[PDB]
Enzyme design. Structure first.
Site, PDB file in Angstrom:
ATOM      1  N   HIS A 199      31.580  16.396  23.495  1.00 27.04           N
ATOM      2  CA  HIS A 199      31.445  15.100  24.133  1.00 27.04           C
ATOM      3  C   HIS A 199      30.078  14.893  24.740  1.00 27.04           C
ATOM      4  CE1 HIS A 199      32.743  11.592  26.353  1.00 27.04           C
ATOM      5  NE2 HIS A 199      32.546  12.166  27.525  1.00 27.04           N
TER       6      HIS A 199
ATOM      7  N   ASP B 132      30.009   7.947  27.837  1.00 27.38           N
ATOM      8  CA  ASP B 132      31.267   8.158  28.558  1.00 27.38           C
ATOM      9  C   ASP B 132      31.486   6.898  29.393  1.00 27.38           C
ATOM     10  OD1 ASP B 132      33.355  10.313  29.188  1.00 27.38           O
ATOM     11  OD2 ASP B 132      32.831   9.462  31.073  1.00 27.38           O
TER      12      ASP B 132
END
Lengths: 297, 297
Positions: free
Chosen positions: B277, B107
């Protein structure tokens, strides 16, 4: 609490099959419907409506779900807040007044209703003015980094509930004032009448109203886009004479030169920039009112 | 707050831009793990023990995140640009005597990592990036669909204090919303509740929230600009790199991740992992295996 910004205008609750439309009604002459947008209410027209009312029967309506208009129950497709449904509801509202053929000027969300109305039911309109918009399709088609940042609220408010609802609840007074300020040329609230800002603030303070606005943007990301897409792909053009006005510092001028754009959407369009940010009727009321009277009369 | 790294030391690493907090464990070649948003170093707690069998694992809070210090930002969001964060982490590693190290980032941390690799490739032996494409690629792919999926890229990048003010009403809601929304399951079930509490507490601090917005502001502006320069100059990461992404994560919605990374990296291998994610928490074993395998030769 809330000032009457339309001295001499009547106040009309118009029944429709989806709920009441609130309107201020003034003037005499050909009917002219004025539709506000986000995050405003009909009072945004308070500086231009009296000038229009010198030559028209001016109906200054709160959009379905906005202001004092009733809020139809939405559904998973946001149907009542699609511009197609709001247009149908406003047509029904105008029919209650006996106006089946009327002039229409819309700003922001109201202008999206307006051009969708013009695409769906062009026989209803004598002339159409849209203030500081491009078609919704065009915003989404133009979507890129720059436009994403500039009109981030198109994607933020379209997030599934209750995400924007909850976030807007974090500071609604700040948010409405921030939108109002940030889209003016000045960047502050000085272009607005404080009494008008009070209207917008009070409407925005209602969570149910905020939810409707999110429903409007959700429709804007989904069904409204799909409806527009159908028209682009069918080559359907608005046949009603139309005026596209936009703020030289406004939202529409960024993505693409608005008259060039609207010319793809409308067979008979004239356009002019107004020296203002997004809120033409409040930042540039004389210029806006002049343009509209010239075009509509 | 739970200690999720049993046996790991705790380091406060001074740098010119503030202290970097890190958990440090293991032995062997140095491996720096960087978390992203809205997380802290503890998101590695399921994979770091496996890594610590083979590497000296440094699990750092990004500058401004977690327990790292928060450099004051500026109008260009400089300390929260990935370029600056990378320089600050290089300084941090140098404080430990790690001038050449392996790096895995997730991320925002992954954005620090590839920017580190572009700027200072000699610092990295190998690089792994988890569930990202370069910032440039996200912005360049910012159409309607993607603007709606990662609306937060444009929302959190709005000028202060707009996102801060909205986030402050109910910070818990937003951090849990984001954690949940980006997982495969769409809830918090993938996370250790003790980890969630770390994330929630970090998010509860308005300064930490501001930093996160600064990060996203940098992501919209300077980071994009830095990337743009590289991609337009054809600069490629020369460090051998692994791109892992979640089959249901963010990166794969923009585009096919390896194809994109092959444009950025001369030596990139990639694998999807069945995960949303949050690869190290949703798929720790698979993530930990992929990283062990990659960094081990």
């Amino acid at each position: 609490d809330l000032a009457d910004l339309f001295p001499g205008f009547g106040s009309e609750w118009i029944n429709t099959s989806s709920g009441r439309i609130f309107a201020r009604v003034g003037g005499d002459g050909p009917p002219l419907l004025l539709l506000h947008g986000f995050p405003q209410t009909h009072v945004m027209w308070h500086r231009v409506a009296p000038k229009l009312a010198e030559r028209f029967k001016v109906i200054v309506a709160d959009l379905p779900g906005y202001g004092w208009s009733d809020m139809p129950e939405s559904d998973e497709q946001h149907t009542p807040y699609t511009k197609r449904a709001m247009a149908k509801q406003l047509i029904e509202a105008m029919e209650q007044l006996g106006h089946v053929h009327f002039a229409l000027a819309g700003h922001d969300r109201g202008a999206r209703v307006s051009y969708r109305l013009a695409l769906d039911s062009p026989g209803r309109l004598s002339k159409l003015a849209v203030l500081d918009i491009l078609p919704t399709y065009e915003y989404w088609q133009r979507m890129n980094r720059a436009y994403a940042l500039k009109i981030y609220h198109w994607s933020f408010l379209a997030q599934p509930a209750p995400l924007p609802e909850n976030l807007l609840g974090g500071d609604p007074d700040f948010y409405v004032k921030a939108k109002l300020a940030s889209w003016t040329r000045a960047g502050d609230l000085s272009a607005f009448d404080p009494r008008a800002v009070e209207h917008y603030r009070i409407a925005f303070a209602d969570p149910m109203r905020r939810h409707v606005m999110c429903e409007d943007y959700r429709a804007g990301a989904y069904a409204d886009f799909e409806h527009d897409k159908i028209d682009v792909e069918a080559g359907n053009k608005i046949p009603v004479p139309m005026l596209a006005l936009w703020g030289a510092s406004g939202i529409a001028q960024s993505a693409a030169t608005p008259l060039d754009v609207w010319r793809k959407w409308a067979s008979d369009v004239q356009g002019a920039p107004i020296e203002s940010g997004h809120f033409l009727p409040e930042e540039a009321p004389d210029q806006t009112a002049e343009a509209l009277v010239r075009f509509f009369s």
